[PDB]
C-alpha cells in the first residue's frame, strides 16, 4: 500500500543518508585530540564536522534547495543539534552506553561529555533518549524520514515561507504513516506513529537545554580557541 512516489522518496533519503554518514569514522583522527573543559576541543570539532554532514543531508531532501537561503539557514539553526542527536544513534551502543566511533579512543560516554562543560540536566536525558531510540528499533527508512521531518518543522523561528515548509512536512509524514501501516500490520498504526513523534518532542527539550548550557560554555571559552566558527554561527556567539 506504499505508493511509487513514497517508495522513491524513502529511497532518495536513504541514498542521501548513506552518502553523508560515514560508519568507518575515518576523519576522527583529524579532529583535535581528546583529553580526559578538557574534552571541548575534540567534541566541538566533532559537532562542527557533523553539522556539515547534516547540511549535506538537507540539500538532498527534495524541496529544501528550493527554499530561500534565509529559510534554510533558520531551519538548520533550529534543528542542527536535534539531527546530530538522532543520527548519533548509529554509533550508540547499550552494551556500555557509549557512542563508539571505530575504536576505543573515539568512544564517548556521559563523563567525557561533562569534560566538555555540559551538565546532568542535559546528559542524563540525552543518554535516556539514546537508549530508548535503540529500543524503538527503527528501520532505515523510519530513521531517515525522522531526520527529514525534524528539519522541515514550519514552526521554527525565522521561517518565512511557512506554507511551503508545512507542505514538505505533510509529504514527509504521509510517507511515514504509509510505511508504518504496511511494514507493521500487527501493531496499532496510531500507536507506532505516536511513539516516534514523541521522540521529536523530546528532541526539542534536549535542544532548549543544550542551548542554555552552550550560552555559558561559549561565554566561558570566549578567549580560548575552543569553539570553531561553524558552531558559533549555528549555536550562538557571545
Amino acid at each position: 500500500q506504499l505508493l511509487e512516489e513514497q517508495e522513491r522518496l524513502i529511497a532518495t533519503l536513504i541514498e542521501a543518508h548513506r552518502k553523508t554518514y560515514d560508519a568507518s569514522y575515518s576523519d576522527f583522527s583529524q579532529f583535535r585530540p581528546p583529553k580526559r573543559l578538557s574534552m571541548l576541543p575534540h567534541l566541538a570539532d566533532l559537532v562542527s564536522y557533523s553539522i556539515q554532514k547534516v547540511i549535506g543531508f538537507a540539500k538532498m531532501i527534495p524541496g529544501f534547495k528550493e527554499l530561500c537561503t534565509e529559510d534554510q539557514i533558520s531551519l538548520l539553526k533550529a534543528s542542527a543539534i536535534e539531527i546530530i542527536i538522532l543520527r548519533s544513534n548509529e554509533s550508540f551502543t547499550m552494551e556500555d552506553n557509549s557512542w563508539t566511533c571505530g575504536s576505543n579512543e573515539f568512544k564517548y560516554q556521559i563523563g567525557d561529555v561533562m569534560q566538555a562543560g555540559h551538565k546532568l540536566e542535559l546528559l542524563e536525558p540525552l543518554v535516556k533518549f539514546q537508549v530508548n531510540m535503540k529500543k524503538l528499533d527503527l528501520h532505515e527508512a523510519e530513521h531517515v524520514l525522522l531526520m527529514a521531518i525534524c528539519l522541515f518543522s514550519p514552526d521554527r523561528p525565522g521561517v518565512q515561507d511557512r506554507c511551503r515548509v508545512e507542505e514538505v512536512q505533510e509529504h514527509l509524514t504521509e510517507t511515514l504513516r504509509a510505511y508504518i501501516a504496511c511494514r507493521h500490520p500487527l501493531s496499532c498504526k496510531h500507536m507506532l506513529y505516536t511513539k516516534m513523534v514523541e521522540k521529536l518532542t523530546e528532541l526539542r527539550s534536549l535542544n532548549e537545554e543544550h542551548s542554555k548550557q552552550y550560552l555559558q560554555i561559549s561565554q566561558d571559552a570566549v578567549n580560548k580557541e575552543d569553539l570553531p566558527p561553524l558552531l558559533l554561527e549555528v549555536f550562538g556567539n557571545p
Binding site: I55, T69, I73, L76, L230, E233
Partner: peptide, 10 residues
C-alpha cells in the same frame, strides 16, 4: 553574517 554557513549552502 553567517559566512561559512552561507558557503556550505553552495
Amino acid at each position: 553574517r553567517h559566512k561559512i554557513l552561507h558557503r556550505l549552502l553552495q
